[PDB]
Design a protein around this nucleic acid. Structure first.
Lengths: 71, 72
DNA sequence: AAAGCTATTATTAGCTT
DNA sequence: TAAGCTAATAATAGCTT
């Protein structure tokens, strides 16, 4: 980025929301790539500060969470 | 990286495993950062090809999953 | 403004031993 | 070789309209 940032809560809602949307896209992109490159099964569940849900799964979310609970 | 790679399954077990270890670390680092920067609850569950479980949660995993199931 | 840009930082693929 | 390196790609923080 233009400047290095410290990893601590962004206090301004506007910057926090813009950062959330962009980093959430980048995080799902890296989960997708890991799933393909390394043939692994991945579930990603995200609740934002306003409590809205976002999710990504490389297969049916149900199959991954079942694997998790039955582990 | 030294060369750009296509996103498709790595066929060699050893390079696949080295890539898995490095990228899983990177992916958990970004999940952790998103949770802190944007004050969000996150759960990440990963099963590798050999079927081993790896996980990250910004709080107790069972809690996030509880939120998930209830939300639904 | 909201959406796109880019200067700079961050990740990582193959190199090195 | 398994662990460290670095050239190169990828992500992204603030800049811009």
């Amino acid at each position: 980025g233009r400047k290095k940032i410290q990893i601590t809560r962004i206090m301004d809602e506007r910057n926090r929301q813009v950062t959330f949307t962009k980093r959430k896209f980048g995080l799902m992109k890296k989960a997708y790539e890991l799933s393909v490159l390394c043939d692994c099964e991945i579930a990603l569940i995200i609740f934002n500060s306003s409590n809205k849900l976002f999710q990504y799964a490389s297969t049916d979310m149900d199959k991954v969470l079942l694997k998790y609970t039955e582990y």
